Amino acid sequence: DVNCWRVYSTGSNVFQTRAGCLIGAEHVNNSYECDIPIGAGICASYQTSQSIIAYTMSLGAENSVAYSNNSI
Amino acid sequence: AIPTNFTISVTTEILPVSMTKTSVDCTMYICGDSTECSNLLLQYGSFCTQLNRALTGIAVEQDKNTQEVFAQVKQIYKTPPIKDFGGFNFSQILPDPSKPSKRSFIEDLLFNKVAARDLICAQKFNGLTVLPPLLTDEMIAQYTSALLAGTITSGWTFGAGAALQIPFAMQMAYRFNGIGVTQNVLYENQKLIANQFNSAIGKIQDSLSSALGKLQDVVNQNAQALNTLVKQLSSNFGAISSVLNDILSRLDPPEAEVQIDRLITGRLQSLQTYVTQQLIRAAEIRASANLAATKMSECVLGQSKRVDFCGKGYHLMSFPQSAPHGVVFLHVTYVPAQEKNFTTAPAICHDGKAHFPREGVFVSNGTHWFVTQRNFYEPQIITTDNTFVSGNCDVVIGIVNNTVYDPLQPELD
Amino acid sequence: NTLVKQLSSNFGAISSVLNDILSRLDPPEAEVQIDRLITGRLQSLQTYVTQQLIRAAEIRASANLAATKMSECVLGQSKRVDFCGKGYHLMSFPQSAPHGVVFLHVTYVPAQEKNFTTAPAICHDGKAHFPREGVFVSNGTHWFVTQRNFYEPQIITTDNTFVSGNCDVVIGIVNNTVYDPLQPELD
Amino acid sequence: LPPLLTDEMIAQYTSALLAGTITSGWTFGAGAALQIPFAMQMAYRFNGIG
Amino acid sequence: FYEPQIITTDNTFVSGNCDVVIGIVNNTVYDPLQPELD
């Protein structure tokens, strides 16, 4: 219930999403499997020293499937 | 009575999948900003811990059921650029480019159909919080679009082993052969079947544009439970007032301890009743989600021979649709329309030997004798290639004398 | 562990053991604490019984699911897709397990696959030749008939196809000759 | 509280279901009702189990 | 079911030779197409 206030300390690595204001995890542009859920399609893990990073989970191998109208 | 005409009718099926996640704090609901109340409730920490554990279990079970219902495939497929299908229409089951999500027109219609004075602000003061779901509407729409693409491309091979492409005509002929309909009937009446399917889709859209009780009963029950939890805070449970500060200001703690204990016991009983009701509702939702997952794995993925399971009629294919806190299916139910009355015969006696069919049936309209099937009207010439001899003629109760033409007779001469 | 720890809670009293209260006060003055402890223990037992009933219902549902799997996968060949494993179910082997059961569902899954040119119908000498239960394929020039599971090239004969009208009512059709092995047998 | 359905209505429904099963076989439960003799439907059901 | 019937060519189909199949037996076939051609 904090839109990054009502926090205990300033901390580090502030990320404001639909789940709230997470302090202590730097968001990355990569996407891996879901490990620890947070909220509204957010999955964080303890991977690379090891630190806490936030990312968006993936639904698998997203690709366009080929369709044939005269072949089988 | 052999059917002659058929009508392609598409029905709907509304089944809940998951609900909302509500977290109730023990201290914030029983007490709040009090010292003696918290000190007396600390002795009952085991009950609050058990309630929190049950709430977390319900919350994770909801996500597990949602993942088991929706997240069923592994390869996210998209729509193909080639729109060659044989005259069919797919503009109502494809993600529109004007929407930021991956919902079609029917999916969007189904989604749209579902301090102090404020409800959320007043509920937040007692610990009642609404946890955000794991799978949002975007992921649900993406999964629905992937399932639709898989069903329109591979049909049913993507749900079991490897994904193999197949045209719409080939899979339609396969589904027609699976129930007992020949391929020539579909090849000769493809435009009529496409027009009937388009008319059924339009009728379904017009009917949906005019209720969704299965997707609203859970919301109504949750709203009633929240209203009951809010109203239970006003009950004193045998006290002079509901506010602990009102009792602690006029009476000493040694005298108000019994009232505080009675209030704590009443709040704990109310919380236990609410938790039991929520557990019953979660069990019902889990059963409904298991039923929906079974229906999706049976009707959508592969052909189902069970009656009264994938709509009223012969189940052919199915197209799932996205819906908030639920799922909507579009089963294809082949149903015969008109029929014709003819004189049937279970056996035909030729020259002292019976002739039983492998799967056909001997019929006559009062003049000639033909052979057909119990599914569609297709009169053919009674030949020896479709019938077999197994016994004589004086052994069948209902036998008749009729000549049998031999196709190999002119070739042997 | 929860039931054991419930005996340590005071439930709004001076202690948690009735013998500790009866040895310091008289029954007429400790009856209130005794009744409070009794009510607390009864509430804890009711909560434990409710949890046990929920767990028993879940166990009964799991046992019904296991019995359905045994009567579908083991006893007989099930025809439901996505149930007796991942792929086409063939057979199963039930194994014993402590408070459970372990099955070995045999799931046939197609591995390698190649693309071939198919055709909805084949025109011979003016009549539409529809296949009996297989499908048509083309390796690049010729045309053969195979099944809907394995790649078995067979010669398109008159015994695997049947006539059902002319070639002017079929939309997707291609011209292809038929071997017809019945002609040399009559000569 | 008295139930909505009585034993007479249940008996009538079961009798109607039995009549439909012995007359139309199984076509009335998945579409239109088609007349079929008992021997024909018995042979059709036996042909599905070899 | 137990239905005695003569093994003819119209009830079976040829598939390969006898060397590619492990389990096989030596038995003649009636083949009613030959007497009908006489």
Q: For residue B408, what are the contacts with CB-CB under 8 A and spacing of at least 6? A: B384, E36
Per the CB < 8 Å rule, is E37 touching B412?
yes
- A&B contacts, CB < 8 Å: 69
Q: How far apart are the CA of B364 and the nearest CA of chain E, in angstroms?
A: 29
CB atoms under 10 Å from CB of C40, counted, come to 22
B159 contacts in chain C (CB < 8 Å): 81-82
Which residue in C149, C124, C150, C146 sits closest to C136, CA to CA?
Answer: C146
The minimum CA-CA distance between B292 and chain D, rounded to whole Å, is: 21
Query: Is-contact D29 B308, C-beta < 8 A?
Result: yes
Taking the CA of residue B76 and the nearest CA in chain D, the distance in Å comes to: 35
Looking at residue B21, its amino acid is K
Q: Phi/psi at B356 (nearest 5 deg)?
A: -100, 140
Residue C154 gets which letter from DSSP? Answer: B
Nearest CA to CA, how far is E2 from chain C (Å)? 22
Burial string for B46-69 (b: 16+ CB within 10 Å, else e) reads ebbebbeebbeebbebbbebbebb
Q: Is the dihedral of CA E3, E8, E12, E15 positive or negative?
A: positive
The answer to whether residues B265 and B273 touch, using CB atoms and an 8 Å cutoff, is no
Query: What is the 8-class DSSP label of residue A71?
Result: B
**Partners of residue D44 in chain B, C-beta under 8 Å:** 374
Maximal CA-CA distance, chain A: 65
Please report all neighbours of E, defined by 3+ CB atom pairs within 8 A. Answer: B, C
CB contact under 8 A, B1 and D26: no
Phi, psi of B400 (to 5 degrees): -140, 155
Those chains having 3 or more beta-carbon pairs within 8 angstroms of chain D are B
Rounded CA Rg of chain B: 32
C-beta separation of B290 from C58 below 8 A: no
Which residues does residue C144 pair with via DSSP β-bridges, in sequence order? C137
Say if the Cβ atoms of E36 and B390 lie within 8 Å.
Answer: no
Strand order in the sheet with B361-364: B343-345, B361-364, B369-372
Which residues does residue A23 pair with via DSSP β-bridges, in sequence order? A14
Sequence-distant (≥ 6) Cβ neighbours of residue D47 within 8 angstroms: B359
Within 8 A of A65 by CB-CB distance, chain B residues are: 75, 77-78, 80, 149-150, 153-154, 163, 165
With an 8 Å Cβ cutoff, are E33 and C186 in contact?
no
Say how many residues make up chain B: 413
Write out the residues of chain A at the interface with chain C, using a CB-CB cutoff of 8 A.
68, 70-72
End-to-end CA distance of chain A: 55
Q: Are B189 and B4 in contact (CB under 8 A)?
A: no
Tell which residue, D43, B249, B316, A72, has the closest CA to residue C143.
A72
- Burial code (b: 16+ CB inside 10 Å, e: under 16) for B272-299 equals bebbeebbebbbebbebbeebbebbbbb
- Count CB-CB contacts under 10 A for residue B142: 22
Distance in angstroms (rounded) separating the CA atoms of residues C100 and C66: 9
Asked if B148 contacts B93 with a C-beta cutoff of 8 angstroms, the reply is yes
Q: Which residue has the tokens 């301890």?
A: B257
- Which helix (DSSP H) or strand (DSSP E) does residue A22 occupy? strand A20-23
Question: In angstroms, rounded to a whole number, what is the distance separating the alpha carbons of residues B89 and B77?
Answer: 19
Method for this entry? cryo-EM
List the structure tokens of D11.
């008996």
Give the one of A68, A70, A72 whose C-beta lies nearest to C135's C-beta: A72
Q: How far apart are CA A50 and CA A34, in angstroms?
A: 17
> Is residue B401 helix, strand or coil?
strand
The per-type count for chain C, helices as H runs and strands as E runs, is 4, 10
CB A63 within 8 A of CB A38: no
Closest to D32 (Cβ–Cβ): which among B308, B336, B341?
A: B336
Report yes or no on chains C and D touching (3+ CB pairs under 8 A): no
Parallel, antiparallel, or unpaired for β B361-364 and B369-372? antiparallel
Report the run of H or E that residue C60 belongs to, with start and end: helix C27-69
Min Cα separation B166/chain C (Å):
10
